[PDB]
Ligand binder design. Structure first.
Ligand code: CA
Ligand code: CA
Ligand code: ZN
Ligand code: ZN
Lengths: 96, 96
């Protein structure tokens, strides 16, 4: 009944919720688990370059330094992953 | 081979490309077409409230006023749609 795009948005919201605690925010070890298990091919391309995408990702996205990733900060991170895929669809190197 | 999350990101990039011209950016009539055909249930919830989500959406997202939506601005808009779905998963009204 929803379109593919609406379904995609809904699946992203479900993935966020999967990694939250009671406060509806993602802590650091859960963000790193989420990234390793849901973005392994993205990360694999970084590792080959010698980029550890992960060290510091949580701190770069936790703009307000509350030690949690809330939904607004999660969307920023999803945007950064999407930007790397957009750049490579235009022949940039993986993990730029 | 890619995970569901990676597939989702890839489908979003494909949807962006579907509405671009030669310059890899989306013009105004194509953004409005993209929204009406890919987010109809989202928009239907706005129309019932008496919100015309669409008037002014292009101008709100075209931060640099070049009369095109580039990928960074498209991600902002996808974030705004996702934020409304996150808010309603927490019992906010549709189109808040
Ligand atoms: Ca935070
Ligand atoms: Ca623009
Ligand atoms: Zn939530
Ligand atoms: Zn493109």
């Amino acid at each position: 009944s929803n379109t593919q795009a609406e379904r995609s948005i809904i699946g992203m919201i479900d993935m966020f919720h999967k990694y939250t605690r009671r406060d509806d925010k993602i802590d650091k070890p859960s963000l790193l688990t989420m990234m390793k298990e849901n973005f392994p091919n993205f990360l694999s391309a970084c590792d080959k370059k010698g980029t550890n995408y992960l060290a510091g990702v949580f701190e770069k996205k936790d703009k307000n330094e509350d030690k949690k990733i809330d939904f607004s900060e999660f969307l920023s991170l999803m945007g950064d992953i999407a930007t790397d895929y957009h750049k490579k669809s235009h022949g940039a190197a993986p993990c730029s």
